[PDB]
Design a protein around this ligand. Structure first.
Ligand SMILES: *[C@H]1O[C@H](COP(=O)(O)OP(=O)(O)OC[C@H]2O[C@@H](n3cnc4c(N)ncnc43)[C@H](O)[C@@H]2O)[C@@H](O)[C@H]1O
Lengths: 313, 76, 76
């Protein structure tokens, strides 16, 4: 198969985002951002999580925002490239609210998409992910994209496209994930990476009644084979970047405190499935976390699925 | 009662707990037993991330239930 | 003549080249097959980095040699 390659212009924007945001410590942290549902307006916070996983130490050096850092961000751009290929093979791709599909995107669209993806969690000021923090952090990343794009990307984006792509990043309360294919692929690429930090419930069964899991969603969109190949690809990227690779064990699904019909639905779509985990690796975590060089070196080392191809012209 | 806490890679422990225990207290018990600071413990049950001020019974966590612990890097 | 290149994923490819082809030409052929732009390519043979404006002949690269492709670094 062919390799997944990111445009060199895109990698330059990645260096800017790493330097000005992803490398920076989180600021909505400390005693003023603790939370208790029993005394909820007691500090600045409106929910839990502000003080979680702010940094980890590797050989005495702190890697800030390890759950939402350079490795996470980079990985998302690999996934959109892969989902673009899968969508062009599909006899009838998912039709978004504007009437367009991922298969209607151009290579130039994918370049623009990849630039916006760089900023998707760049606005975060902690691991807080309840409604208000999520929306503020997305708003901040959208404005960081805008400010950079007006200064350096006006040869690539019109003022209209800057506001459209800022919108996709912002993800307003009133907006659906599939308003446009540009927006949908950004959301889906982000979705795939959640396997790094979510339990089997969210990944296979759906986090609440009515919600599809992450992996069932990929199967409904790309079919069972490509859906599972995307999953295994993401897991390959986790290993290359030193993430803990989760175990998969469908025999445990009925024992996780979830409604049995949520379990039957997952077994009928996914099938029985058992895959070993792998412990995190501190050296690969640092190589992927501390430079675009290191991270891109790791990501391009992973083989792509056998069906991956790109149009060269 | 006894509950299980499992990392995403499958490393398992038990805890002895009560249904009224707060999640803050549970993270203290994990810190005692495994050395992991409470601020590196992202805990999840039945698809939901757990808050510190709620209790085990608030999430309907019962004897022999399994909590998932998202640990990024042991030693980090 | 035929030479081989070990690509970034570890996969080997074949190229059809001449001893008088420049390294720049060789990167262009890799782009044509794989989609990797020349500006991301660093090519190594017998431990030495190969420089654009030189030829295969200049490095004594013969038929069925294998070149290793690695990422060209940006210092960031
Ligand atoms: C602690 O860390 C996690 C992970 O943080 P992230 O910023 O990586 O993730 P979010 O909390 O923003 O995840 C929600 C977003 O994921 C995408 N999503 C989820 N489900 C779907 C579907 N079904 N279709 C498309 N996209 C989806 C969206 O972007 C959504 O807003 C954090 O959660 C804390 O626990």
């Amino acid at each position: 198969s062919m390799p997944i390659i990111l445009d060199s212009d895109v990698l330059e924007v990645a260096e800017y985002v790493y330097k000005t945001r992803l490398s920076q410590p989180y600021t909505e942290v400390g005693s003023e951002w603790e939370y208790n549902y029993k005394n909820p307006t007691a500090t600045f916070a409106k929910g839990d999580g502000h003080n979680l996983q702010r940094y980890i130490t590797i050989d005495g050096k702190q890697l800030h925002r390890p759950i939402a850092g350079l490795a996470h961000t980079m990985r998302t751009l690999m996934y959109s490239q892969l989902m673009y290929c899968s969508s062009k093979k599909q006899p009838s791709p998912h039709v978004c609210q504007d009437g367009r599909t991922i298969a209607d995107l151009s290579e130039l669209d994918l370049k623009k998409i990849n630039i916006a993806q760089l900023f998707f969690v760049a606005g975060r000021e902690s691991e807080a992910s309840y409604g208000d923090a999520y929306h503020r952090y997305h708003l901040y990343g959208a404005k960081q994209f805008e400010e950079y794009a007006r200064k350096h990307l006006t040869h690539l984006f019109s003022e209209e496209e800057i506001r459209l792509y800022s919108r996709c990043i912002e993800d307003r309360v009133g907006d659906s994930f599939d308003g446009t294919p540009e927006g949908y692929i950004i959301h889906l690429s982000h979705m795939i990476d959640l396997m790094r930090c979510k339990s089997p419930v969210e990944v296979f069964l759906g986090h609440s009644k009515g919600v599809s899991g992450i992996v069932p969603t990929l199967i409904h969109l790309f079919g069972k084979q490509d859906g599972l190949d995307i999953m295994h690809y993401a897991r390959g990227l986790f290993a290359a970047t030193g993430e803990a690779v989760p175990y998969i064990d469908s025999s445990e699904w009925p024992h996780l405190g979830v409604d049995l019909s949520r379990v039957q639905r997952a077994l009928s779509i996914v099938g029985d499935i058992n895959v070993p985990g792998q412990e995190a690796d501190s050296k690969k975590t640092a190589q992927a976390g501390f430079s675009v060089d290191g991270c891109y070196s790791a990501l391009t080392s992973v083989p792509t699925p056998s069906w991956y191809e790109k149009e060269l012209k | 009662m006894q509950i299980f806490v499992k990392t995403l890679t499958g490393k398992t422990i038990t805890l002895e707990v009560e249904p009224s225990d707060t999640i803050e207290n549970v993270k203290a018990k994990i810190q005692d037993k495994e050395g992991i600071p409470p601020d590196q413990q992202r805990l999840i049950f039945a698809g939901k991330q757990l808050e510190d001020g709620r209790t085990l019974s608030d999430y309907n966590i019962q004897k022999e239930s399994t909590l998932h612990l998202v640990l990024r890097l042991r030693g980090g």
